[PDB]
């Protein structure tokens, strides 16, 4: 079951997600990616019910890309977050609600890095770090303990690696590998997978 | 069900059934115990001799658990009851305390069973 | 509720108790359950008060309009048919047990039952509502072919009084109406005017 | 009882100077059917104490049987001690609580009235063992319809004469007959004073139906 | 809630308490339950508060369009029909229980209107959680053709019965008196309940509350 | 509630918050959730307030009787086992209890987790209660058998603190105990508002 | 209960020529705190604020949809909305969803844009309005809030005393509620300025 | 399904002073939307030194208090002394737990003098979880009373205030204030406030009027 | 079922229909629902057939033994009391609506109702069973104080006939019994002997 | 969630069990032992509901040991399995049923090695190999594919290790270590834990 994490530093946001797709008692894929690139400087990380997660993320992704094509420039992380929220909330009481939980990470030229948390109800919160999934219960306090607002990216990846080690130790599910990416002024960078 | 008071006081403070039970012990085969420095030994007389006896079947020395054994003198049928009761109790102890019994613990249990059969109706 | 109507040569007699209950609270003790649908056509209402009031208002509208268009008084049979259509069509959303009675020049005095479910049947006399259960035997034994208007009125008042004594959901006053070519005559029996039959003491 | 069968409606009670009066109609209803129209829902317990019961009449009859036997038992001793109204009310509290606690209640709400040692006693006990005392009581629909009238009179004049209490009870019984679909216009009034317990009936209230011509 | 009305010799007296509750807590000690319908017609409301407010406002507005059109003073039957037809359509989901009273060219008229759309035309009515207490007063004491002051006494007594005997009711008694000649909207009529006074003082001086952050934004 | 305990070179650290709730209502900020069973044995309390208090008090009675009959201290194993056997009979009846039994006996420092579901297990570290997930993260990242005494105190205190911060149902003060070979000591009681200031 | 899924508390309070509105700062999901700086009070004018407790998603939707409507109103009309009119606008917005409501119960606090007269109100989730002359409260600790307000509030308080009263009412109320707190924010609204403060508060 | 419980309302409060205890309650007994009586106190004298407040389901309040009374006499007969405030509290915990699977629907607060003559308050949940407190509200309006006591008696959330001892006169003023506030908002609290003051001289009683609506 | 009994000066009249149903199948069309409990004491049974037979057989046993011991004919009030005790005590496990009627030397003709739930009340006449609902009005209008035996028999036959016409769960024949100091007289009304009242066909 | 496995060769039985004790989303112990020594040549491996599992296994254990003390010699694996089954079956319709699933492994002087399977209903089957737990779904076919009746113990531990690797690869739960023991004519032998 699905784990998302984000940590925002002074000029970047780091994000990671597990790579498992499971079904019943089996992992069916171990290189699954739960991140969706919305624009040069925006990732949407999406977990929840099957079908809803991809349908929702891809719809958001295509509309963000459409906005870019229509206007010549991109939606800010904050605008995209609010766009995402409006869609989810507008569907909440409709015949087609989407059961998805999200993180939105981005870097804006003028606002700097941003990390947004959203639940399936479409409550939106800006946070210095955040996580979703049952794994969040075991890692949020690790983040509260060691995060600082000026944390460097070398130390953020170390902190991330304490969180992921804690899941190996203490979480009942087998989540042995994680996708890791960072966003800053120069866009989206793939880091090495963190594996056990 | 049979509720007669069997063991009762007599005028000079005696419990005659208990004294008679002691007489039964006195007619049993001799048994001796000696506590060594790092060994303990039990030895016991006869039972019969009797060439046609299967010796194995009449031992008067009995394991209660791995770390505790006992000899007795007196009514052998009575002993078998006490021994089995103690064997059961050694397994409760291990069950609930996760240690073998001390020798004192099981001795105390046996003694308390014996005392009860001197103060209970029908026995 | 208890409602009743009876045909005689030249007209009809209608009656009802006056109790409206929510649970076992009496929300109206002097209810008028006999509602005029046209000059000489009434309906007796039982069941949901909201339902029977809405249905009766609607039928009154339909019948009035129909009557103007035709330029003739309406048939009692037509009034009953309009009730039936609405009570049958909406039988899943209504709790209505109706008696339609009245006079017209073509067929004289007529009584129709439209019970729950929305069937319609003409009868010499009709009873309905929760209290009607307690007067089937009475009306079966007491009814006689060829009663006068005055006899129909007494027979009605008696039946209703008996129902009212026994049914917790019926009571109050007895409202009567007689309808004939000459018109509608309404009256109320109250207190000591209600027929009285002793409790059977030892 | 899990499911009440034949039942009685409201019982009223009010204290007055020198006694207590209680009232109850004579009906046993079977659902909405007014089935048994001449039954008494009031018991003389002993000389100082009376009881009136709402709810399941078979359970009331049981209580009457038990409590009647207890007063006989006590009179056999002829020892100068008698169950006071307060004691009877205590006993009844325990018995209702106890039955409630076995998940098998006696399906009743009761009014105990008494007079002993110069004091008027009026007490309530329900099927759950809820019990208390007050200057006036009304069970069932009486709690909604009669009690507001009783308490309003008693705020203007806490101490009523016997005849004033009696007139007030009659006014309440009228209201109940107008507004409770399980009531019946045939009731009893029981009074306890120095002289003992008197039960009067069958009684009826005059009713007014003028409003039938004011559909307004 | 306790709401009630009476027809007296020359008009209508409507009455209401002023408590609104959420669960078993008092939310408003002084809410107004006697709602304007037209200058000659008012309506007490009980039940779901937003439903009573919105229902009476809508009908009042449609009646104003009606009277603007006709050039005449509206009729009580018209308000009754409009309310009951709307409530019927909604099948009881609009939880408005109303006492409608007024005086029109045909004189005084009083109706009770239930959520499911039934109505009763009667010379006295009560509604709300306090309605049996108020009805007991009316059954015991109403007479036809009372004088104004007697009718106002009877209605306030009846509301008081609900106030004191129903946990759902409280605070003040409002009345509205409607005749051919006069509209007296008496809010409050009586204030039989008052908060006791405060014996200790908790005038906590500046600095008592520790402050983490402060921003003053000056305005024009 | 959040409670934790852990064995290490210098014995066993035992810590708890002090909140009690009734639904979402905060009933108390000053509950004692570490019961002194005897001068070498502690029990911790999480779950139903009455259930924990009653059953640990009963455990204390029984351990004392045991001591009187057998003329020696009950072991941590045997005490934890007495509790497990008492509650086992009630499974399915809605008792809610999660306890750590913490002592030092002839086998050295001892720590057992025991609950109303029937679990009884020995281990190095545990956390129990609505806030346990949060305490585990912090305890786990700092735990070592070779912690110094003051470092172990700091860790226990911090773990409970961080639990009170995330978990709506944990709070008040952090109460900390230390089981040593000659008995437990009460180390400190620190209000979570004073700890926030510090951390 | 839907209304407690996120927890939270808002209140408003009247003083002489000033009003106050306050909120806790926790955004949580059942037991789990997610953030501690979640906004629940929103400007609807220079001297007019709305506070929303209830389900966080609906807090945000109502605030946003209300702003949409208000901005259109102010562009079309000459002028800044009156407090009482804002209340009505909000009532109408909430009652449109009578049969599938937003799970939020707002409080409004402000000064009339022309007269500077103080106004406070609250509404239930389907838009029933309630104006008062003292205070209003909404949220998962409403009982606690009522108990503090009833005991401390007095008439005609100056801005400093109003600030202490509303602050002590909030802090002490939320400290008896597991799912409200993690901070308190207070806005004092006066004719010539807004004063915004965060309070030293328990963080458990 | 017969329900063996009903809610009958009622608010209780106890405060410990240096040499006194207060136990206070309203006098309303309710059921549904009706008032049974306006003169039904929730305080019960147990000994000269101990008073208990009980609210919730009245059938259980009556039974439990009669059980406590009987147990106090049994204790006195076997042990030749009156039960102390603390022993009454510990005993009550066990009586409440004995119904763990069919609880007494009662909220109990004990107020009295401890063995050094000092104020003692003990508060309970329905199945007997308890502790000693300095002050405590219970019952219907407890959420309304408690925060104000936290603030004014506990001095919580206040800076630069001298934490003085609680005088009897102040504690009395507070008790009356909080019940008056509660009568404003809790529909179940009202009619009258009954106050018992336990000191070494004995137990004295004040009553004050509350709103009747 | 419809059952009835009526007091007169010197005895009682009892009556029942004869229909036993399972659902709407008639499992017995000629049921005898009037069961002798002693020489001059009968009960009329409605409700569950298994229950009322079991209860009647038990009471018969109790009353017979009591009667031998006392060496006197049993009181009607004693029979009713025994029914009541058993119907009340087991009111959760029985569906039994009973009328006890008979004669004894001390109190003469007597009718007792023991309806479901197990209350007991003496009455001048009693009706019960499912069909009774349809004759309350009739019996209330028709009852007269001081009816003779023959009048009680007619009144009973007529009431039962009316109930039987309307109640799907009643029907068949009418069984009547009269009980007095001289004894018990039983008869059956069948076919054309059952009172007849026209269906009110249209003029 | 709990895994048990047994493989019987010509003159030994090999058994393994996971070492996790879990609760809700957390592993609370990673060195748990699910094996109970009944006698010199009998292991009982027990999983299922908390409380039931230990209460049941220890009751059996104590009674087996009592038999030894009463009689001078031990119950055969077969006799012990049947004893175990009698008790479980006798409790099945009682007020105190035990929700436990078992393997019994033993070596008898005259019958050789034995492996018994039992479910909570108390159906008893002798098997050449068997497993319990959700992990069984992913390992039984591995055993069917490669087991032969003459399998040597060196190859049995290898086959065991293929099963346990399959759980690391494919199972959704985190089971990183296993207890392993063998029983033969010389009694019960602890093997190294198999760990990941
Ligand atoms: Cl052992
Ligand atoms: Cl109607
Ligand atoms: Cl019908
Ligand atoms: Cl009908
Ligand atoms: Cl009807
Ligand atoms: Cl009526
Ligand atoms: Cl009768
Ligand atoms: Cl009597
Ligand atoms: Cl109309
Ligand atoms: Cl209402
Ligand atoms: Cl503490
Ligand atoms: Cl022991
Ligand atoms: Cl273990
Ligand atoms: Cl917990
Ligand atoms: Cl640390
Ligand atoms: Cl919108
Ligand atoms: Cl037949
Ligand atoms: Cl039969
Ligand atoms: Cl019956
Ligand atoms: Cl019957
Ligand atoms: Cl039948
Ligand atoms: K009636
Ligand atoms: K109040
Ligand atoms: K038939
Ligand atoms: Mg879907
Ligand atoms: Mg409908
Ligand atoms: Mg809080
Ligand atoms: Mg917390
Ligand atoms: Mg009130
Ligand atoms: Mg049966
Ligand atoms: Mg079980």
Swiss-Prot record, chain B:
Function according to Swiss-Prot or TrEMBL: Component of the 20S core proteasome complex involved in the proteolytic degradation of most intracellular proteins. This complex plays numerous essential roles within the cell by associating with different regulatory particles. Associated with two 19S regulatory particles, forms the 26S proteasome and thus participates in the ATP-dependent degradation of ubiquitinated proteins.
Covered range of the whole protein: 2 to 124 of 248
Localization per record: Cytoplasm; Nucleus
Induction note: Down-regulated by the ribozyme Rz3'X. Up-regulated in colorectal cancer tissues.
Assembly and binders: The 26S proteasome consists of a 20S proteasome core and two 19S regulatory subunits. The 20S proteasome core is a barrel-shaped complex made of 28 subunits that are arranged in four stacked rings. The two outer rings are each formed by seven alpha subunits, and the two inner rings are formed by seven beta subunits. The proteolytic activity is exerted by three beta-subunits PSMB5, PSMB6 and PSMB7. PSMA7 interacts directly with the PSMG1-PSMG2 heterodimer which promotes 20S proteasome assembly. Interacts with HIF1A. Interacts with RAB7A. Interacts with PRKN. Interacts with ABL1 and ABL2. (Microbial infection) Interacts with HIV-1 TAT protein.
GN (gene name): PSMA7
Protein name in UniProt: Proteasome subunit alpha type-7
Family, similarity comment: Belongs to the peptidase T1A family.
UniProtKB/Swiss-Prot annotation, chain F:
Residues of the full protein shown: 60 to 258 of 263
Main enzyme class: hydrolase
Chain's gene name: PSMB5
Function: Component of the 20S core proteasome complex involved in the proteolytic degradation of most intracellular proteins. This complex plays numerous essential roles within the cell by associating with different regulatory particles. Associated with two 19S regulatory particles, forms the 26S proteasome and thus participates in the ATP-dependent degradation of ubiquitinated proteins.
Compartment annotation: Cytoplasm; Nucleus
Family: Belongs to the peptidase T1B family.
Residue ranges of coiled coil: none
Binding site for bortezomib: 49
Name the UniProt record assigns to this protein: Proteasome subunit beta type-5
UniProtKB/Swiss-Prot annotation, chain G:
Keyword Acetylation appears in the UniProt entry: yes
GO biological process, one term: proteasome-mediated ubiquitin-dependent protein catabolic process
InterPro entries reported in the protein's UniProt record: Ntn_hydrolases_N, Proteasome_beta_3, Proteasome_bsu_CS, Proteasome_sua/b, Proteasome_suB-type
Residues the record lists as N6-acetyllysine modifications: 76
Origin: domain of life: Eukaryota
GO cellular component: cytoplasm; cytosol; extracellular exosome; nucleoplasm; nucleus; proteasome complex; proteasome core complex; proteasome core complex, beta-subunit complex
Localization per record: Cytoplasm; Nucleus
Database matches in Gene3D superfamilies: Glutamine Phosphoribosylpyrophosphate, subunit 1, domain 1
Transmembrane segments: none
A Pfam family that the UniProt record links to this protein: Proteasome
Chain positions found as N-acetylserine: 1
PROSITE patterns, per database record: PROTEASOME_BETA_1 (PS00854), PROTEASOME_BETA_2 (PS51476)
Induction: Up-regulated in asthenozoospermic sperm.
Keywords: Acetylation, Cytoplasm, Host-virus interaction, Nucleus, Proteasome
Sequence similarity: Belongs to the peptidase T1B family.
Its job: Non-catalytic component of the 20S core proteasome complex involved in the proteolytic degradation of most intracellular proteins. This complex plays numerous essential roles within the cell by associating with different regulatory particles. Associated with two 19S regulatory particles, forms the 26S proteasome and thus participates in the ATP-dependent degradation of ubiquitinated proteins.
Record's protein name: Proteasome subunit beta type-3
Native source species: Homo sapiens
Gene from which the chain derives: PSMB3
Swiss-Prot record, chain I:
Post-translational modification Phosphothreonine, affected residues: 35
Compartments where located: Cytoplasm; Nucleus
Highest taxon of source: Eukaryota
EC number(s) recorded for this UniProt protein: 3.4.25.1
Catalytic EC class: hydrolase
GO terms under cellular component: cytoplasm; cytosol; extracellular exosome; mitochondrion; nucleoplasm; nucleus; proteasome complex; proteasome core complex
Record: active site: 1
UniProt keyword terms in alphabetical order: Acetylation, Cytoplasm, Host-virus interaction, Hydrolase, Nucleus, Phosphoprotein, Protease, Proteasome, Threonine protease, Zymogen
GO molecular function terms noted in the UniProt entry: cadherin binding; endopeptidase activity; threonine-type endopeptidase activity
Catalytic activity annotation: Cleavage of peptide bonds with very broad specificity
Induction: Down-regulated by IFNG/IFN-gamma (at protein level). Up-regulated in anaplastic thyroid cancer cell lines.
Keyword Phosphoprotein attached: yes
Any one GO biological process: proteasome-mediated ubiquitin-dependent protein catabolic process
Functional description taken from the UniProt entry: Component of the 20S core proteasome complex involved in the proteolytic degradation of most intracellular proteins. This complex plays numerous essential roles within the cell by associating with different regulatory particles. Associated with two 19S regulatory particles, forms the 26S proteasome and thus participates in the ATP-dependent degradation of ubiquitinated proteins.
Similarity annotation: Belongs to the peptidase T1B family.
Record-given protein name: Proteasome subunit beta type-6
Organism per entry: Homo sapiens (Human)
């Amino acid at each position: 079951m699905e784990y998302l994490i984000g940590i925002q530093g002074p000029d970047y946001v780091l994000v990671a997600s597990d790579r498992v797709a499971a079904s019943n008692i089996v992992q069916m894929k171990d290189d699954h990616d739960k991140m969706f690139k919305m624009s040069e400087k925006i990732l949407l990380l999406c977990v929840g019910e099957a079908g809803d997660t991809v349908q929702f993320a891809e719809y958001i992704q295509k509309n963000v890309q459409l906005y870019k094509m229509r206007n010549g420039y991109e939606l800010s992380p904050t605008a995209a977050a609010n766009f995402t929220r409006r869609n989810l909330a507008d569907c909440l009481r409709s015949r087609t609600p989407y059961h998805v939980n999200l993180l939105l990470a981005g870097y804006d030229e003028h606002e700097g890095p941003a990390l947004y948390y959203m639940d399936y109800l479409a409550a939106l919160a800006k946070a210095p770090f955040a996580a979703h999934g049952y794994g969040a219960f075991l890692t949020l306090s690790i983040l509260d303990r060691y995060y600082t607002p000026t944390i460097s990216r070398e130390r953020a990846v170390e902190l991330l690696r304490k969180c992921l080690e804690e899941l190996q130790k203490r979480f009942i599910l087998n989540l042995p590998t994680f996708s890791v990416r960072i966003i800053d002024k120069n866009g989206i960078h793939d880091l090495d997978n963190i594996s056990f | 069900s049979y509720d007669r008071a069997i063991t009762v006081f007599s005028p000079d403070g005696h419990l005659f059934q208990v004294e008679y039970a002691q007489e039964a012990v006195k007619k049993g085969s001799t048994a001796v115990g000696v506590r060594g420095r790092d060994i303990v030994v039990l030895g016991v007389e006869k039972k019969s001799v009797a060439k046609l006896q299967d010796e194995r079947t009449v031992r008067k020395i009995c394991a209660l658990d791995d770390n505790v054994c006992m000899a007795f003198a007196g009514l052998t049928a009575d002993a078998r009851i006490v021994i089995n009761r103690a064997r059961v109790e050694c397994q409760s102890h291990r069950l609930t305390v996760e240690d073998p019994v001390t020798v004192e613990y099981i001795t105390r249990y046996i003694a308390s069973l014996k005392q009860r059969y001197t103060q209970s109706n029908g026995r | 509720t208890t409602i009743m109507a009876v045909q005689f040569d030249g007209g009809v007699v209608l009656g009802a108790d006056s109790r409206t209950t929510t649970g076992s609270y009496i929300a109206n003790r002097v209810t008028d359950k006999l509602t005029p649908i046209h000059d000489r056509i009434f309906c007796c209402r039982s069941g949901s008060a909201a339902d029977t009031q809405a249905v009766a208002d609607a039928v009154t509208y339909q019948l009035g309009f129909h009557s103007i268009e035709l330029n003739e008084p309406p048939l009692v049979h037509t009034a009953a048919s309009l009730f039936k259509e609405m009570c049958y069509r909406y039988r899943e959303d209504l709790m209505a047990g109706i008696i339609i009675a009245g006079w017209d020049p073509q067929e004289g005095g007529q009584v129709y039952s439209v019970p729950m479910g929305g069937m319609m049947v003409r009868q010499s006399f009709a009873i309905g509502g929760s209290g009607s259960s307690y007067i089937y035997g009475y009306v079966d034994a007491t009814y006689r072919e060829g009663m006068t208007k005055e006899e129909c009125l007494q027979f009605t008042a008696n039946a209703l009084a008996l129902a009212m004594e026994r049914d917790g959901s019926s009571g109050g006053v007895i409202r009567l109406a007689a309808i004939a070519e000459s018109g509608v005559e309404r009256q109320v029996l109250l207190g000591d005017q209600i027929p009285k039959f002793a409790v059977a003491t030892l | 009882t899990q499911n009440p069968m034949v039942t009685g409606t409201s019982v009223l009670g009010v204290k007055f100077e020198g006694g207590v009066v209680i009232a109850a109609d004579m009906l046993g209803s079977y659902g909405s059917l007014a089935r048994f129209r001449n039954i008494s829902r009031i018991m003389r317990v002993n000389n100082s104490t009376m009881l009136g019961a709402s709810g399941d009449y078979a359970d009331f009859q049981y209580l009457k049987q038990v409590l009647g036997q207890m007063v006989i038992d006590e009179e056999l001793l002829g020892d100068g001690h008698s169950y006071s109204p307060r004691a009877i009310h205590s006993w009844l509290t325990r018995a209702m609580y106890s039955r409630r606690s076995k998940m098998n209640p006696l399906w009743n709400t009761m009014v105990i009235g008494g007079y002993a040692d110069g004091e008027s006693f009026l007490g309530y006990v329900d099927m759950l063992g809820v019990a208390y005392e007050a200057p006036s009581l009304a069970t069932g629909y009486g709690a909604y319809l009669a009690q507001p009238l009783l308490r309003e009179v008693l705020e203007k004049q806490p101490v009523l004469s016997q005849t004033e209490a009696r007139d007030l009870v009659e006014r309440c019984m009228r209201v109940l007959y107008y507004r409770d679909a399980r009531s019946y216009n045939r009731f009893q009034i029981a009074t306890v004073t120095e002289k003992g317990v008197e039960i009067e009936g069958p009684l009826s209230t005059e009713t007014n139906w003028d409003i039938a011509h004011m559909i307004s | 809630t306790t709401i009630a009305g009476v027809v007296y010799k020359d008009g209508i007296v409507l009455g209401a308490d002023t408590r609104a509750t959420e669960g078993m807590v008092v939310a408003d000690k002084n809410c107004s339950k006697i709602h304007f319908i037209s200058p000659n017609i008012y309506c007490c409301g009980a039940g779901t508060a937003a439903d009573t407010d919105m229902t009476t406002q809508l009908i009042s507005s449609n009646l104003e369009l009606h009277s603007l059109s006709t050039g005449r003073l509206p009729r009580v039957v018209t308000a009754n029909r409009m309310l009951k037809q709307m409530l019927f359509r909604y099948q009881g989901y609009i939880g408005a229980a109303l006492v409608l009273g007024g005086v029109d060219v045909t004189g005084p008229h009083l109706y009770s209107i239930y959520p499911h759309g039934s109505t009763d035309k009667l010379p006295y009515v009560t509604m709300g959680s306090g309605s049996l207490a108020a009805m007991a007063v009316f059954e015991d004491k109403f007479r036809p053709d009372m004088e104004e002051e007697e009718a106002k006494n009877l209605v306030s007594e009846a509301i008081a019965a609900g106030i004191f005997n129903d946990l759902g009711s409280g605070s003040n008694i409002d009345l509205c008196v409607i005749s051919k000649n006069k509209l007296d909207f008496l809010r409050p009529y009586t204030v039989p309940n008052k908060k006791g006074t405060r014996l200790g003082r908790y005038r906590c001086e500046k600095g008592t509350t520790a402050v983490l952050t402060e921003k003053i934004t000056p305005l024009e | 509630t959040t409670t934790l305990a852990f064995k290490f070179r210098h014995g066993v650290i035992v810590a708890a918050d002090s909140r009690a709730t009734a639904g979402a209502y905060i009933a108390s900020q000053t509950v004692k959730k570490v019961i002194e069973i005897n001068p070498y044995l502690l029990g911790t309390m999480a779950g139903g307030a009455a259930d924990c208090s009653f059953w640990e008090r009963l455990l204390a009675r029984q351990c004392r009787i045991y001591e009187l009959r057998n003329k020696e201290r009950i072991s941590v194993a045997a005490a934890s086992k007495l509790l497990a056997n008492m509650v086992y009979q009630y499974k399915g009846m809605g008792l809610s209890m999660g306890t750590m039994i913490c002592g030092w006996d002839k086998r050295g420092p001892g720590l057992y987790y025991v609950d109303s579901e029937g679990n009884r297990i020995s281990g190095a570290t545990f956390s129990v209660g609505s806030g346990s997930v949060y305490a585990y993260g912090v305890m786990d990242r700092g735990y070592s058998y070779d912690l110094e005494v003051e470092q172990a105190y700091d860790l226990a205190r911090r773990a409970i603190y961080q639990a009170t911060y995330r978990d709506a149902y944990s709070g008040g003060a952090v109460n900390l105990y230390h089981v040593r070979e000659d008995g437990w000591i009460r180390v400190s009681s620190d209000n979570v508002a004073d700890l926030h200031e510090k951390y | 209960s839907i209304m407690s899924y996120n927890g939270g508390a808002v209140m408003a309070m009247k003083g002489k020529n000033c009003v106050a509105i306050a909120a806790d700062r926790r955004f949580g999901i059942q037991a789990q705190m997610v953030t501690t700086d979640f906004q629940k009070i929103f400007p609807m004018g220079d001297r007019l604020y709305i506070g929303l407790a209830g389900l966080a998603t609906d807090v945000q939707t109502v605030a946003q949809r209300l702003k949409f409507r208000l901005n259109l109103y102010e562009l079309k009309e000459g002028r800044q909305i009156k407090p009482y009119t804002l209340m009505s606008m909000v009532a109408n917005l909430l009652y449109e969803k009578r049969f599938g409501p937003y799970y939020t119960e707002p409080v409004i606090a402000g000064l009339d844009p022309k007269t500077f007269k103080p106004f406070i109100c609250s509404l239930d989730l389907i838009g029933c309005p309630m104006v008062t002359d003292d205070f209003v409260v909404s949220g998962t600790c409403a009982e606690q809030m009522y108990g503090m307000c009833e005991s401390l509030w007095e008439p005609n308080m100056d801005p400093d005393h109003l600030f202490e009263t509303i602050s002590q009412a909030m802090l002490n109320a939320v400290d008896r509620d597991a799912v409200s707190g993690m901070g308190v924010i207070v806005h004092i609204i006066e004719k010539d300025k807004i004063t915004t403060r965060t309070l030293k508060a328990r963080m458990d | 399904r017969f329900s063996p419980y009903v809610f009958n309302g009622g608010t209780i409060l106890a405060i410990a002073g240096e040499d006194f205890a207060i136990v206070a309650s309203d006098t309303r007994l309710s059921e549904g939307f009706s008032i049974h009586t306006r003169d039904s106190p929730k305080c019960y004298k147990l000994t000269d030194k101990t008073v208990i407040g009980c609210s919730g389901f009245h059938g259980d309040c009556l039974t439990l208090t009669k059980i406590i009374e009987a147990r106090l006499k049994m204790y006195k007969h076997s042990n030749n002394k009156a039960m102390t405030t603390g022993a009454i509290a510990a005993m009550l915990s066990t009586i409440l737990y004995s119904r763990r699977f069919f609880p007494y629907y009662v909220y109990n607060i004990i107020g009295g003098l401890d063995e050094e003559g000092k104020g003692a308050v003990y508060s309970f949940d329905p199945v007997g979880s308890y502790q000693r407190d300095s002050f405590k509200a219970g019952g219907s309006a407890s959420a309304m009373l408690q925060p104000l006591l936290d603030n004014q008696v506990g001095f919580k959330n206040m800076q630069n205030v001298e934490h003085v001892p609680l005088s009897l006169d102040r504690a009395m003023r507070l008790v009356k204030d909080v019940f008056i506030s509660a009568a404003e908002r809790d529909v179940y609290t009202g009619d009258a406030l009954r106050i018992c003051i336990v000191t070494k001289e004995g137990i004295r009683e004040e009553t004050v009027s509350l709103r009747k609506d």
